[PDB]
């Protein structure tokens, strides 16, 4: 006396942020990807966009997109009681400090 | 993301993309995310895990 029944199947992930590399192989071979070095070669300035399909939420929700860059401080003391730090970020900047 | 939206519009200007790495993304809830644009939000009424 088992009733007719259909599968529902799903997954969860918690504490994970999705990762889409920027590589041709989709895998790391160094921290500076091979497609970051092909825009060094030539660039006309390209404009990005994405679309996303997100499941409905009764609650208000936000999307958080992280664009993975380099944020590197070079910091030096040339004399006693002196500190000077230059801040360089690569493709994004958004009014980046000390440029 | 408005309530009950199924599409999110993204807009990024023309920029050099030299030394770009991946993308990473996750979805949050509005009430569970404080704004760091100011040092006090009178609309952050959530004290749970951010």
């Amino acid at each position: 006396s088992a009733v007719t029944s259909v599968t529902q199947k799903k997954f969860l992930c918690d504490r994970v942020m999705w990762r889409i590399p920027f590589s041709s192989n989709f895998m790391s071979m160094g921290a500076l990807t091979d497609l970051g070095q092909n825009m060094l070669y030539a660039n006309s300035a390209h404009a990005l966009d994405m679309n996303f399909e997100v499941d409905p939420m009764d609650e208000s929700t936000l999307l958080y997109v992280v664009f993975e860059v380099f944020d590197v401080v070079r910091v030096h003391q040339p004399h006693r009681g002196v500190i000077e730090a230059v801040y360089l970020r690569t493709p994004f900047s958004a009014g980046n400090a000390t440029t | 993301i408005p309530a009950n939206a199924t599409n999110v519009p993204i807009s990024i200007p023309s920029r050099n993309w030299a030394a770009f790495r991946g993308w990473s993304f996750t979805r949050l809830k509005t009430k569970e995310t404080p704004s760091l644009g100011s040092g006090f939000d009178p609309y952050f009424v959530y004290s749970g895990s951010i």
């Binding site: 590399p21 790391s28 921290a31 380099f70 | -």
Partner: peptide, 26 residues
């Protein structure tokens, strides 16, 4: 790589006659 961590100009060494730490620069 996927998140940065590339650092370190170090190897470490201990001169012989036992392992005797510090060469104190050569």
């Amino acid at each position: 790589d996927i998140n940065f961590s590339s650092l370190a100009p170090r190897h470490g060494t201990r001169p012989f006659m036992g392992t005797w730490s510090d060469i104190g620069t050569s």
